[PDB]
């Protein structure tokens, strides 16, 4: 009478996994993390190590600035709210032994725990 | 010489429910460069051909919006300067296209868009009558 | 006599680039736009926001890569993705270059809540279109 | 070496371990014709990173392929 | 006609609008609560992103010492010269 | 750090009209309605009159963002004519050319 | 659960490595969710708390405390009409509107003329 | 002090996997690109500027990626993933017979961080009353109720839905509206009998 193809469900990453497996690794080319121009082209192991370590240090500097001044990036301009992009909050609340104890496992340190045991 | 042995493929599952049937997918690209629009059109039509689906092509007219500004700063009413934005349309219709084919093709094309172009989908799907009617 | 994004003819002692040389009324005929977005087209919106944010980005990146650039930038906004392209000189160390690259990338990403990435092309000395 | 060679390439990780692996790999390949070896090499040199070049030089010597050493020295330089 | 009046009443009951007759001063309520006000529009809500955030960020980052603000350098040097010369 | 005190006042007015937007809408509907009591219309009118200043969305002005110029500004771009011409000539923004038609 | 997630993050740190392709970069962006999921419905998130068309449009359930003849009925019917015509605001906003109206005319119940 | 290595032009061979060396969208990168393609208005007895300083190739949109070979490769890869259309549905009369109720929605996509835009909510649908009503009294009643939603030249009843912001809200509200409309056109009234 009528034939209908059945529906399927995919992961958002599965399509791009297919696209990536379609293509092999780039030949005669440094990693994608490194730039393409020849001057910035890291041409040795030690200097490349130092380079991507400087990049990671910039990442840590970004973390430091964001967690030091959260109110600047507090605006959620993007329509999809993302905690990965939201600023980070390791701020102890007001004196409250029960909520402070619940926040212990959230702050991930030891001075708060000493003070709470006290 | 470095050729992989076994290419890992993503998992695919055929859900028990039926797939939706798109009657016609009409895509409209608004651009600034006729050459970019032509390249994008060749890309899309070749992709649709290699996927094995129907296609038609036509070039709607060019639309323009222009406006006059004061050429100088303080006192010059007769001396003005004009400006205009030109938007060029290109429409493409795909007929008798399955839902999963639509999803994969639109994902591909949307990832392979160029920058200075806007893309407008009109999806047209058929359905039988409800059960309350 | 019109003075708008053009160079004054000198004795021949003024190196000028392609963009800085050509006139603004030559922009669509013999140039491209520094930005590429769809807010200007019909039906879209947030064009004012696009322009404000891209101007601020240009200023911030010019001042956080000072003395190394020699021309205007190329912005390429594909849907969500934001791509920057710059041409710079080999003044400072690649250490500093990559450090500032990562720094600006992280700042732009956290500020705009948008996937940002940039490319930079090295030149020994800034290219010149003519000597006016 | 060919046997030791889906997403199992994440277990390399640190640049030090990657360096040791690639070094020993290319060393074994040099001290194994060497046309296929230099093919693999000239393929992976940009992706890949003194001892390896020494082994390359002695392999090229035992091979007698004199014309190849110049390009290798130029690449290293 | 009464027939067309009741036809309109039925169409109104179906599509949401009022069946009972109504004046323009009363449909004022309808369209006012249909379209939100200019004050509530996002364009009036955010006419531009805050120079507060922008300038505070750039000032703090200059104090960090990464953005060589040429205009700020200029202003500072001329302020120094002014306070030197009186 | 807004450009100037008039921009400050404009933004204050914008935020006041926003945070009193729905209230003003409701009471203005209650005023302009016709079948309801005229005494109720007068009640709502006195309420609007007692509402604070700088709360109406008419006192605001669509001023410029860069140079704070009220006149010669496009509602779409929100930029003054001078700065718009500057950016268009320098090619900063996308898809505008000279109308040589 | 605690030591479980500790071991899980340890294994994660052991796995993670630098990518070598823009396809992998995009896979990363998608798996953290910054990259848009095509098809673009313009509604990935913001589902209005599973609200319903009838909850938006049919306000007779929220109209209880007045008969169906008076001018208050006229006004509130016009309010429900305009709200149903408005898509921008949801059932929460509409019930807040009608609740403020209830409060208003119940505080100004002096007249009832 | 330090000098930049020469570009990949001499390095890249004539036999080369361009789909592999340019997998995704990326800028021109003349150091990696071997082509001498130049672009720029030449001076009198001059030439366009070389690719190294030709930032206008970067200004223009980029299509070095996604070569015809790459497109063929990706289509051959996704052929196993894409499905087939029913062969029975090969004509408009047949497809509208199998599924008379036409329905279509739409939305734009634009470059930027935000993705929401109210035009996502609007939808429309169509159905011809030639075969669905199966009666005359309810048909006359329905055509008297609807003012401009019909068209007898093409003989299709079309209706739009935008009252709700959500696409599925619009969809199911249109469905419920059509259902109640049919159920109310089924019956009649005494003032309706009197005409
Ligand atoms: Mg003139």
């Amino acid at each position: 009478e009528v034939v209908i193809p059945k529906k399927k469900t995919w992961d958002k990453v599965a399509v791009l996994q297919a696209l990536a497996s379609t293509v092999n690794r780039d030949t005669t080319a440094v990693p994608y993390v490194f730039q393409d121009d020849p001057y910035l082209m890291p041409a040795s192991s030690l200097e490349s190590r130092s380079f991507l370590l400087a990049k990671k240090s910039g990442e840590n500097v970004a973390k430091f600035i964001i967690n030091s001044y959260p109110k600047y990036f507090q605006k959620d301009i993007a329509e999809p709210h993302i905690p990965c992009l939201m600023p980070e909050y390791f701020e102890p609340q007001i004196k409250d032994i029960s909520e402070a104890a619940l926040k212990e496992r959230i702050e991930l340190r030891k001075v708060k725990a000493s003070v709470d045991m006290f | 010489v470095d050729v992989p042995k076994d290419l890992t493929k993503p998992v695919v599952t055929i859900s028990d429910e039926p797939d939706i049937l798109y009657k016609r997918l009409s895509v409209l690209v608004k651009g600034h460069d006729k050459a970019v629009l032509d390249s994008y059109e060749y890309f899309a039509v070749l992709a649709a051909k290699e996927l094995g689906i129907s296609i038609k092509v036509h070039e709607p007219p060019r639309k323009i919006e222009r406006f006059t500004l004061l050429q100088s700063v303080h006192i010059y009413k007769k001396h003005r300067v004009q400006y205009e934005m030109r938007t060029l349309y290109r429409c493409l219709e795909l007929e008798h296209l399955t839902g999963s084919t639509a999803d994969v093709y639109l994902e591909y094309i949307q990832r392979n868009l160029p920058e200075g172009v806007a893309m407008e989908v009109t999806k047209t799907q058929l359905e039988q009558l409800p059960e309350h009617i | 006599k019109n003075r708008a994004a053009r160079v004054r003819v000198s004795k021949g002692d003024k190196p000028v680039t392609y963009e800085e040389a050509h006139a603004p009324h030559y922009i669509a005929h013999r140039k491209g736009w520094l930005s590429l977005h769809t807010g200007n087209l019909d039906g879209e919106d947030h064009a004012a926001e696009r322009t404000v944010e891209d101007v601020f980005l240009r200023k911030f990146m010019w001042g956080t890569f000072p003395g190394c650039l020699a021309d205007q930038l190329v912005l390429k906004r594909r849907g969500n993705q934001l791509e920057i392209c710059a041409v710079v000189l080999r003044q400072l160390s690649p250490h500093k270059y990559y450090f500032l690259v990562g720094y600006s990338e992280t700042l732009l990403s956290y500020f705009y809540k948008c996937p940002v990435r940039l490319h930079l092309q090295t030149v020994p000395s800034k290219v010149v279109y003519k000597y006016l | 070496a060919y046997q030791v060679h889906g997403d199992n390439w994440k277990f390399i990780g640190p640049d030090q371990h990657r360096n040791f692996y690639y070094s020993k790999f290319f060393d074994l390949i040099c001290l194994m014709q060497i046309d296929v070896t230099l093919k693999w090499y000239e393929d992976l040199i940009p992706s890949a990173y003194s001892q390896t070049m020494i082994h390359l030089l002695q392999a090229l010597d035992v091979a007698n392929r004199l014309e190849v050493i110049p390009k290798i020295w130029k690449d290293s330089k | 006609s009464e027939y067309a009046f009741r036809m309109s009443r039925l169409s109104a009951r179906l599509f949401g609008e009022v069946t009972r007759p109504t004046n323009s001063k009363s449909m004022k309520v309808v369209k006012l609560f249909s379209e939100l006000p200019l004050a509530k529009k996002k364009e009036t809500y955010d006419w531009y992103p805050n120079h507060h955030t922008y300038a505070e960020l750039m000032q703090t980052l200059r104090f960090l010492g990464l953005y060589r603000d040429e205009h700020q350098d200029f202003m500072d040097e001329q302020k120094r010269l002014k306070k030197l010369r009186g | 750090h807004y450009v100037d005190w008039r921009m400050w006042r404009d933004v204050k007015r914008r935020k006041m009209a926003y945070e009193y937007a729905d209230e003003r809408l409701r009471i203005n509907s209650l005023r302009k309605n016709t079948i309801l009591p005229k005494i109720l219309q007068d009640v709502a009118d006195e309420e609007i009159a007692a509402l604070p200043r700088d709360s109406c969305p008419v006192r605001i002005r669509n001023r410029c963002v860069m140079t704070s110029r009220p006149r010669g500004v496009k509602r779409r771009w929100r930029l003054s004519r001078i700065v718009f011409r500057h950016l268009a000539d320098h090619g900063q923004l996308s898809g505008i050319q000279r109308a040589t038609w | 659960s605690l030591w479980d997630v500790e071991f899980a993050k340890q294994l994660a740190t052991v796995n993670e490595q630098p990518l070598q392709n823009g396809f992998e970069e995009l896979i990363q962006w998608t798996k953290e969710g910054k990259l848009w999921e095509f098809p673009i419905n313009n509604e990935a998130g913001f589902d209005d708390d599973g609200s319903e068309f009838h909850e938006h449009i049919f306000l007779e359930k929220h109209l209880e405390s007045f008969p169906k003849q008076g001018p208050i009925r006229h006004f509130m019917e016009l309010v429900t009409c305009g709200l149903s015509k408005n898509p921008y605001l949801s059932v929460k906003q509409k019930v807040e509107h009608i609740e403020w109206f209830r409060n208003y005319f119940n505080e100004k119940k002096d007249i009832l003329k | 002090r330090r000098k930049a290595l020469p570009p990949r032009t001499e390095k890249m061979a004539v036999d080369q996997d361009w789909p592999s060396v340019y997998p995704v969208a990326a800028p021109f990168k003349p150091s990696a690109v071997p082509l001498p393609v130049r672009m720029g208005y030449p001076v009198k007895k001059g030439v366009p500027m070389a690719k190294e300083g030709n930032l206008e190739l970067l200004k223009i949109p980029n299509f070095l990626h996604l070569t015809p070979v790459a497109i063929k490769k990706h289509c051959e890869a996704l052929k196993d993933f894409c499905t087939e259309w029913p062969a029975a549905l090969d004509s408009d009369e047949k497809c509208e017979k199998h599924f008379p109720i036409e329905i279509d929605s739409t939305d734009y996509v634009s470059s930027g961080p935000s993705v929401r835009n109210p035009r996502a909510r609007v939808v429309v649908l169509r159905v011809k009353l030639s075969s669905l009503n199966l009666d005359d009294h309810a048909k006359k009643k329905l055509i008297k109720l609807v003012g401009e939603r019909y068209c007898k030249t093409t003989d299709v009843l079309t209706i739009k839905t935008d009252r709700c912001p959500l696409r599925r809200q619009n969809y199911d509200y249109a469905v419920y509206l059509l259902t109640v409309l049919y159920h109310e056109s089924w019956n009649t009234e005494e003032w309706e009998k009197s005409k």
Side-chain angles (χ1 to χ4, degrees):
Chain A
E1 180 42 80
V2 175
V3 302
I4 298 165
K6 289 175 73 173
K7 185 264 285 180
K8 60 180 75 173
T9 181
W10 290 345
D11 184 8
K12 63 182 77 66
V13 182
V15 176
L16 278 289
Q17 187 214 309
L19 270 301
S21 65
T22 303
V23 180
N24 58 6
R25 179 171 62 187
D26 186 313
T27 57
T28 69
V30 302
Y32 180 80
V33 178
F34 299 155
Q35 293 294 323
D36 52 316
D37 70 72
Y39 182 70
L40 277 299
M41 191 64 69
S44 170
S45 300
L46 184 63
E47 54 84 19
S48 66
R49 189 189 295 276
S50 65
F51 288 3
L52 83 160
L53 189 64
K55 188 171 284 296
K56 193 266 182 185
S57 73
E59 301 312 279
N60 192 356
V61 166
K63 185 266 284 179
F64 179 74
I65 181 67
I66 184 166
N67 71 8
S68 66
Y69 296 103
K71 72 180 65 55
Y72 291 163
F73 309 162
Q74 75 201 327
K75 286 177 89 69
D76 194 25
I77 299 102
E79 283 288 340
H81 180 273
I82 303 164
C84 165
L85 277 294
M86 288 299 104
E88 191 273 328
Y89 290 95
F90 61 99
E91 69 96 20
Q93 63 269 12
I94 188 55
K95 191 266 181 186
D96 42 12
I97 55 172
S98 45
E99 189 35 79
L102 269 296
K103 166 259 292 176
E104 286 284 324
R105 60 175 61 83
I106 310 304
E107 278 295 329
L108 278 292
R109 76 175 60 91
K110 71 182 72 63
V111 179
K112 61 178 178 69
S114 67
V115 174
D116 262 348
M117 188 67 202
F118 183 83
Chain B
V1 178
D2 195 306
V3 186
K5 294 181 180 181
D6 57 338
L7 80 176
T8 180
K9 66 184 289 297
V11 65
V12 295
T13 179
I14 306 300
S15 69
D16 46 343
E17 57 262 59
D19 196 38
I20 58 169
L21 279 72
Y22 288 103
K23 184 258 180 66
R24 186 177 66 249
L25 178 61
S26 149
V27 65
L28 191 283
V29 184
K30 298 186 263 74
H32 293 284
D33 185 358
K34 186 176 179 180
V36 174
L37 292 173
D38 292 331
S39 176
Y40 189 78
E41 184 273 359
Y42 185 82
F43 178 79
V45 67
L46 196 280
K49 188 274 298 299
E50 190 63 25
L51 267 293
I53 56 174
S54 315
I55 183 66
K56 65 185 287 295
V57 299
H58 66 92
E59 189 271 331
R62 61 186 175 92
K63 187 169 73 67
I64 301 95
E65 62 92 21
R66 60 182 64 84
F67 52 97
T68 68
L69 272 72
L70 282 78
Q71 188 175 182
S72 177
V73 180
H74 189 194
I75 47 103
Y76 287 104
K77 181 58 64 61
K78 295 182 284 294
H79 294 284
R80 293 186 181 92
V81 65
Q82 298 180 354
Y83 290 96
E84 65 180 1
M85 186 276 289
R86 294 183 181 178
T87 185
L88 298 172
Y89 298 171
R90 295 296 298 276
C91 182
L92 298 172
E93 268 76 23
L94 295 174
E95 298 82 0
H96 293 88
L97 199 140
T98 305
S100 63
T101 63
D103 308 299
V104 63
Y105 185 76
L106 67 87
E107 285 169 349
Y108 184 73
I109 298 297
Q110 288 176 1
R111 293 292 179 100
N112 307 133
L113 197 78
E115 294 81 6
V117 298
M119 193 275 288
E120 168 56 26
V121 296
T122 60
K123 303 179 285 293
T124 72
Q125 65 183 359
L126 295 169
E127 185 177 1
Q128 70 276 23
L129 276 292
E131 65 290 348
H132 295 87
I133 62 96
Chain C
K1 186 179 284 187
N2 291 320
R3 303 294 298 167
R6 63 189 71 185
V7 297
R8 181 69 69 196
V9 62
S10 56
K11 279 74 70 176
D13 50 16
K14 183 64 68 176
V16 64
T17 65
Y18 189 90
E19 291 48 47
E20 210 173 20
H22 286 83
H25 64 278
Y26 296 153
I27 187 165
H29 302 286
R30 292 195 290 276
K31 296 174 67 171
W33 291 272
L34 297 170
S35 163
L36 294 173
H37 69 96
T38 58
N40 294 115
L41 291 172
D42 57 348
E44 292 82 7
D45 61 354
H46 295 91
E49 187 271 0
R50 295 272 79 80
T51 305
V52 170
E53 64 86 20
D54 78 7
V55 166
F56 180 75
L57 187 150
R58 288 176 188 278
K59 289 175 73 68
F60 182 89
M61 70 181 291
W62 180 263
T64 57
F65 290 95
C68 296
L69 279 74
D71 56 356
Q72 299 305 108
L73 287 299
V74 180
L75 299 176
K76 287 172 76 68
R77 287 177 290 183
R78 185 183 294 111
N80 204 350
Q81 299 175 359
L82 195 147
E83 302 180 355
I84 300 163
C85 284
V87 179
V88 296
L89 298 173
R90 61 191 71 190
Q91 296 295 110
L92 297 171
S93 80
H95 298 92
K96 294 180 178 178
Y97 284 112
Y98 282 157
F99 184 74
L100 272 293
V101 163
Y103 184 72
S104 66
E105 282 292 335
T106 53
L107 283 180
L108 299 155
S109 296
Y110 295 161
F111 182 79
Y112 295 108
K113 313 281 187 299
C114 180
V116 174
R117 66 99 63 241
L118 68 88
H119 290 281
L120 72 164
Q121 182 181 175
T122 183
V123 181
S125 165
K126 67 185 288 297
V127 65
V128 62
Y129 186 73
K130 290 189 289 185
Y131 294 101
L132 278 291
Chain D
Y2 295 165
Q3 189 273 329
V4 174
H5 188 70
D7 195 0
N8 290 317
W9 63 274
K10 67 175 75 64
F11 300 152
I12 299 95
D15 189 341
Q16 64 185 359
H17 300 293
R18 190 169 64 250
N19 181 355
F20 185 84
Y21 175 86
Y22 286 161
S23 67
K24 302 295 102 177
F25 193 66
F26 189 64
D27 291 315
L28 294 177
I29 293 162
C30 289
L31 62 95
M32 61 181 285
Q33 58 83 34
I34 52 166
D35 188 329
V36 181
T37 68
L38 55 87
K39 189 184 268 294
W40 189 267
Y41 175 69
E42 62 83 28
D43 290 326
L44 281 301
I45 292 160
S47 44
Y49 63 89
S50 59
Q51 59 187 356
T52 60
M53 296 300 99
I54 294 160
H55 293 92
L56 185 159
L57 289 175
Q58 61 84 44
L60 266 292
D61 187 317
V62 300
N64 295 319
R65 288 182 176 86
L66 192 146
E67 66 274 18
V68 191
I69 298 99
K71 273 71 71 177
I72 314 304
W73 179 77
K74 270 89 174 170
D75 217 9
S76 67
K77 183 179 82 65
Chain E
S1 88
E2 292 179 353
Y3 182 78
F5 184 71
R6 294 181 185 275
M7 287 291 105
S8 66
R9 288 179 69 253
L10 292 174
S11 65
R13 185 177 291 173
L14 291 170
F15 294 101
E17 61 271 18
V18 66
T19 67
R20 177 182 57 254
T22 180
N23 193 39
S24 57
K25 294 183 177 69
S26 291
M27 295 185 287
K28 187 178 282 293
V29 174
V30 176
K31 75 258 197 181
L32 285 177
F33 287 98
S34 79
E35 57 253 34
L36 74 160
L38 75 167
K40 193 179 283 292
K41 297 287 185 180
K42 287 177 92 291
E43 289 79 2
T44 62
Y45 178 72
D46 45 277
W47 187 251
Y48 62 94
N50 49 356
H51 296 87
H52 294 285
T53 304
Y54 287 108
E56 292 290 327
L57 188 150
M58 299 310 296
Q59 184 176 182
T60 55
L61 197 145
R62 179 174 171 77
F63 296 169
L64 265 297
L66 277 79
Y67 180 98
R68 292 194 291 182
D69 187 339
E70 295 170 350
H71 192 273
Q72 187 63 254
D73 292 327
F74 183 77
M75 293 189 293
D76 189 356
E77 283 115 25
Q78 270 93 40
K79 188 181 265 74
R80 180 180 61 80
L81 294 172
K82 188 181 265 75
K83 295 289 102 176
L84 190 148
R85 292 184 291 111
Chain F
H1 296 287
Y2 292 162
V3 176
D4 54 357
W5 291 95
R6 59 184 65 195
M7 182 181 286
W8 180 254
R9 293 193 301 277
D10 186 75
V11 173
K12 288 192 294 191
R13 292 184 187 94
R14 288 176 187 274
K15 283 189 261 68
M16 291 299 104
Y18 178 76
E19 64 93 23
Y20 288 160
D22 195 359
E23 290 80 0
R24 288 180 67 87
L25 186 147
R26 292 186 186 95
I27 287 93
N28 287 319
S29 66
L30 291 167
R31 285 179 65 249
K32 301 287 100 173
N33 52 190
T34 183
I35 190 165
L36 281 81
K38 300 293 186 291
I39 60 98
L40 183 63
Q41 184 175 4
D42 310 301
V43 165
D45 205 6
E46 297 320 327
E47 291 163 0
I48 293 298
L51 286 177
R53 184 60 60 81
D54 285 308
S55 44
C56 61
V58 298
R59 190 176 288 273
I60 59 95
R61 182 65 180 273
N62 297 116
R63 299 180 64 86
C64 183
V65 61
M66 296 295 290
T67 61
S68 320
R69 186 177 172 81
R71 294 182 178 89
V73 180
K74 299 297 292 183
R75 186 69 60 82
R76 184 175 182 177
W77 294 271
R78 301 179 183 176
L79 273 71
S80 175
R81 56 180 172 79
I82 296 167
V83 65
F84 180 80
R85 180 169 186 271
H86 184 266
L87 271 73
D89 290 17
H90 290 284
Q92 300 296 113
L93 76 167
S94 171
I96 295 96
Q97 63 185 356
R98 294 291 183 87
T100 60
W101 177 60
Chain G
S1 77
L2 185 63
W3 295 99
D4 301 324
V5 62
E6 291 172 62
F7 181 78
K9 61 171 72 67
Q10 184 62 255
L11 184 136
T13 54
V14 170
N15 293 125
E16 55 79 20
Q17 73 286 13
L19 58 89
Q20 286 73 60
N21 188 0
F23 283 108
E24 278 64 353
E25 184 66 28
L26 296 172
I27 288 161
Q28 183 171 2
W29 291 358
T30 52
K31 74 202 309 175
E32 57 245 26
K34 62 176 73 173
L35 197 285
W36 292 349
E37 172 63 331
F38 300 160
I40 300 299
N41 58 347
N42 298 110
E43 296 295 328
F46 181 33
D47 298 348
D48 208 23
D49 302 277
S51 59
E52 285 79 2
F53 65 94
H54 66 277
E55 294 181 354
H56 289 91
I57 296 165
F58 295 101
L59 276 296
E60 264 181 353
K61 70 207 177 287
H62 294 284
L63 273 295
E64 64 290 338
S65 70
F66 190 78
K68 197 186 282 186
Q69 80 281 323
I72 297 165
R73 180 70 178 172
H74 184 81
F75 183 79
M76 296 299 291
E77 184 177 1
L78 298 169
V79 164
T80 56
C81 299
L83 293 171
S84 66
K85 274 94 166 73
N86 187 1
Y88 293 100
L89 295 201
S90 87
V91 185
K92 279 77 70 175
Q93 294 83 18
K94 298 181 184 184
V95 296
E96 283 144 21
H97 282 286
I98 64 96
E99 184 63 26
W100 189 80
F101 291 163
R102 294 287 186 186
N103 292 318
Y104 181 77
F105 74 80
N106 290 120
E107 192 273 329
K108 190 56 66 176
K109 189 173 170 64
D110 305 68
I111 303 97
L112 266 289
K113 298 283 99 171
Chain H
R1 300 291 297 163
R2 300 297 88 194
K3 188 261 176 185
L5 54 88
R8 300 177 63 190
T9 308
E10 66 274 17
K11 181 172 72 69
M12 293 179 72
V14 66
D15 313 318
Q16 197 281 119
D17 185 337
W18 295 95
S20 186
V21 166
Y22 298 100
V24 299
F28 185 72
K29 56 176 77 66
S31 67
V33 175
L35 297 174
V37 289
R38 63 179 67 257
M39 185 263 285
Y41 189 76
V43 184
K44 58 177 75 67
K45 65 176 182 69
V47 294
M49 298 295 165
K51 62 189 287 185
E52 295 77 23
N54 185 353
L55 79 165
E56 294 75 5
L57 298 173
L58 284 294
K59 293 288 286 296
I60 60 171
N62 199 2
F63 289 95
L64 84 165
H65 59 95
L66 297 168
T67 61
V69 178
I71 300 162
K72 292 186 289 292
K73 183 63 68 65
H74 296 98
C75 289
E76 184 283 347
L78 276 295
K79 187 69 175 178
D80 57 355
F81 288 101
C82 77
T83 59
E84 60 88 23
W85 184 262
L89 300 170
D90 52 359
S91 67
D92 61 330
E93 71 280 17
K94 289 173 74 67
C95 80
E96 65 87 20
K97 183 262 286 182
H98 289 93
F99 299 97
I101 307 299
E102 174 65 35
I103 184 162
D104 42 345
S105 166
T106 185
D107 57 354
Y108 295 94
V109 65
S110 51
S111 295
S114 172
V115 67
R116 280 80 163 85
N117 198 2
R119 82 290 179 276
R121 75 184 183 275
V122 297
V123 64
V124 305
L125 62 86
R126 297 187 293 276
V127 61
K128 62 180 75 174
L129 298 171
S130 65
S131 65
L132 188 274
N133 209 156
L134 277 296
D135 57 357
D136 190 341
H137 179 75
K139 187 181 286 294
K140 299 301 295 296
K141 184 172 175 182
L142 189 150
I143 193 70
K144 184 64 69 176
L145 261 299
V146 303
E148 67 287 328
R149 279 71 176 271
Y150 64 93
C151 186
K152 301 294 101 177
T153 60
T154 184
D155 185 8
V156 305
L157 192 286
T158 186
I159 65 98
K160 63 97 173 180
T161 305
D162 58 25
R163 300 175 66 81
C164 281
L166 276 295
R167 183 174 290 172
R168 67 120 167 94
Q169 290 182 4
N170 293 316
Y171 176 80
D172 63 340
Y173 173 70
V175 173
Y176 184 77
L177 183 63
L178 189 148
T179 301
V180 175
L181 189 147
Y182 183 78
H183 284 113
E184 293 293 329
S185 296
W186 183 257
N187 63 5
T188 184
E189 295 293 328
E190 77 295 340
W191 59 266
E192 193 276 330
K193 291 186 287 292
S194 66
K195 286 173 69 173

